[PDB]
Design a protein around this nucleic acid. Structure first.
Ligand SMILES: [Zn+2]
Lengths: 82, 48, 48, 98
DNA sequence: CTCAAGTACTTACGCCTGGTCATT
RNA sequence: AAAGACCAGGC
């Protein structure tokens, strides 16, 4: 659907958080450029977590509605549970 | 005997906690309910 | 997709060797799967 | 008396010689670890049993419990990637392998 | 032709360890 | 040795 009239929870579900963190960690571990600055962080998982806390993950979540439509939420647009 | 600032903080906490309690879309509720039903059956006696 | 006359077996499928694996007997002999034995019986009676 | 600090234990302990028997069940004969070992001839899946270096079974109840977690790709790994992975070439017109 | 009252299928926890035996 | 059956046993 369009950017207007979006109806889902603005909160990001724990499943979305888990999958986006896993995907971002895999990308980081596969030489993708990091978004947040890293202070001696060699572990991609903590790097992805720090990126999430800074809302800098370059991923948009496509939330499929049961009727076949979908809605695109950037991780920055979604507000972190933690 | 709450104060005004305390009342505002309480309203904020109520809103935040209620929004946290909302079921997350994507949650597998069917399997969760089936397991939450079958688990007590293990501890239930076969005799009446 | 499915016609009535296709439900009468006139051409019998023969599953590949993966479905009915043969077991190497120390390289000297080769035993056969139960499916292979049933296939042998079917081919014998069909030729007869 | 406490073995470490030497202080008297406040409670008085019940001590006496009691007959104890060692059992056949011992950890050295029960511990098992699997990491990409032998596979079954038919299913091309990890073998059965400790002696054959077989893998542990991720039963139906296991996948139901993981579904309750909503752990989709952990389940995919457990049932597709950790166990037998495979690729097939299937036609586009017919849905049958080619 | 068409309704209730007899005859067929189909299934009964989760793994885990091992030892023995007949065919192959 | 292969899968099949049986048996005994642990939680
Ligand atoms: Zn085709």
């Amino acid at each position: 659907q369009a950017n207007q009239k979006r109806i889902t929870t603005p909160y990001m579900t724990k499943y979305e958080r888990a999958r986006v963190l896993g995907t971002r960690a895999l990308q980081i571990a596969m030489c993708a450029p990091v978004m947040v600055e890293l202070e001696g962080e060699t572990d991609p998982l903590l790097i992805a977590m720090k990126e999430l806390k800074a809302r800098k993950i370059p991923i948009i979540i496509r939330r499929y509605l049961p009727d076949g439509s979908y809605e695109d939420w950037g991780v920055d647009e979604l507000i972190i549970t933690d | 005997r709450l104060s005004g600032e305390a009342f505002d903080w309480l309203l904020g906490e109520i809103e935040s906690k209620f929004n946290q309690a909302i079921a997350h879309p994507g949650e597998m509720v069917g399997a969760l309910a089936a397991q939450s039903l079958g688990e007590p059956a293990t501890q239930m006696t076969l005799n009446t | 997709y499915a016609r009535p006359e296709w439900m009468i077996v006139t051409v019998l499928p023969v599953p590949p060797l993966s479905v009915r694996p043969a077991v190497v007997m120390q390289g000297s002999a080769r035993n056969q799967d139960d499916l292979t034995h049933k296939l042998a019986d079917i081919v014998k009676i069909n030729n007869q | 008396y406490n073995g470490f600090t030497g202080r008297k234990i406040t409670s008085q302990i019940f001590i006496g010689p009691t007959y104890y028997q060692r059992l056949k069940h011992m950890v050295d004969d029960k511990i098992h670890s699997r990491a990409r070992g032998p596979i079954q001839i038919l299913n091309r899946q990890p073998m059965e049993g400790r002696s054959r270096d077989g893998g542990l079974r991720f039963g139906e109840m296991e996948r139901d419990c993981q579904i309750a977690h909503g752990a989709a790709q952990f389940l995919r790994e457990r049932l597709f990637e950790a166990s037998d992975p495979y690729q097939v070439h299937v036609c586009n017109l017919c849905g049958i392998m080619a």
